[PDB]
Design a protein around this ligand. Structure first.
Ligand SMILES: COc1ccc([C@H](C(=O)Nc2ccc([Si](C)(C)C)cc2)N(C)C(=O)c2cc(=O)[nH]o2)cc1
Length: 215
């Protein structure tokens, strides 16, 4: 696969992300001004831990379906076997969702887009796990600092999915070949856009996955 082929991979990964991104960036930014009042916040705080888990679970499961579409529309993905497709999505879909969420995080006021408005982490008080929530907020904060472009997120989240170190792969070599082609594609596109500096600022390998040890 020469460099003109790798350039099709970039444009293809970026198209799939644009089609499957669930919420437009423009809308998330437009909506940053629309914030939950103290009354509305209290309203969420009063809800049962069960109600809030069912809400968050619904929304996160919805987000997971878009990550499944994203993966389906990657050429290279569908050429993998039935088993490995499941292993990869099992291991990474939620990592991908978390990464995607930074787009819905506003670092000026430490709020996240939830049910039509922006709110802080106190919105989720009824879950009874503010350590988990604070560390998710810090994680979005640190990605927010990078000012990830849409195409950067596209390419990074593909690399989150396509990871040949996942336990239980039957065609390890095949997933490696895909992984290395996406690593190159990412690097090449960063070079085209003079954004090589973001590579050193990316999260460590498995700091993303260690955030799903509590989860
Ligand atoms: C792919 O990126 C996404 C960005 C925002 C949303 C939000 C949401 O889900 N935000 C959200 C959930 C969970 C925690 Si958490 C408990 C991990 C800190 C934070 C924040 N969203 C669309 C909705 O909340 C929503 C309201 C509605 O009526 N239907 O869906 C989903 C996906």
């Amino acid at each position: 696969a020469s460099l003109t082929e790798i350039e099709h991979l970039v444009q293809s990964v970026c198209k799939s992300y644009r089609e499957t991104c669930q919420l437009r960036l423009e809308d998330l930014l437009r909506q940053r001004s629309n914030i939950f009042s103290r009354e509305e916040v209290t309203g969420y705080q009063r809800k049962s831990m069960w109600e809030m888990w069912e809400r968050c679970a619904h929304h996160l499961t919805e987000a997971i379906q878009y990550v499944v579409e994203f993966a389906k529309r990657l050429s290279g993905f569908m050429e993998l076997c039935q088993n490995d497709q499941i292993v990869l999505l099992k291991a990474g879909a939620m990592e991908v969702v978390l990464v995607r969420m930074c787009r819905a995080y506003n670092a000026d006021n430490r709020t996240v887009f939830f049910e039509g408005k922006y709110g802080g982490m106190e919105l989720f008080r009824a879950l009874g796990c503010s350590e988990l929530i604070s560390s998710i907020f810090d994680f979005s904060h640190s990605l927010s600092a990078l000012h990830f472009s849409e195409d950067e997120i596209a390419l990074y989240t593909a690399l989150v999915l396509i990871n040949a170190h996942r336990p239980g792969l039957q065609e390890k070599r095949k997933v490696e070949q895909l992984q290395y082609n996406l690593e190159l594609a990412f690097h090449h596109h960063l070079c085209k856009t003079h954004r090589q500096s973001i590579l050193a600022k990316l999260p460590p390998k498995g700091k993303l996955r260690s955030l799903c040890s509590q989860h």
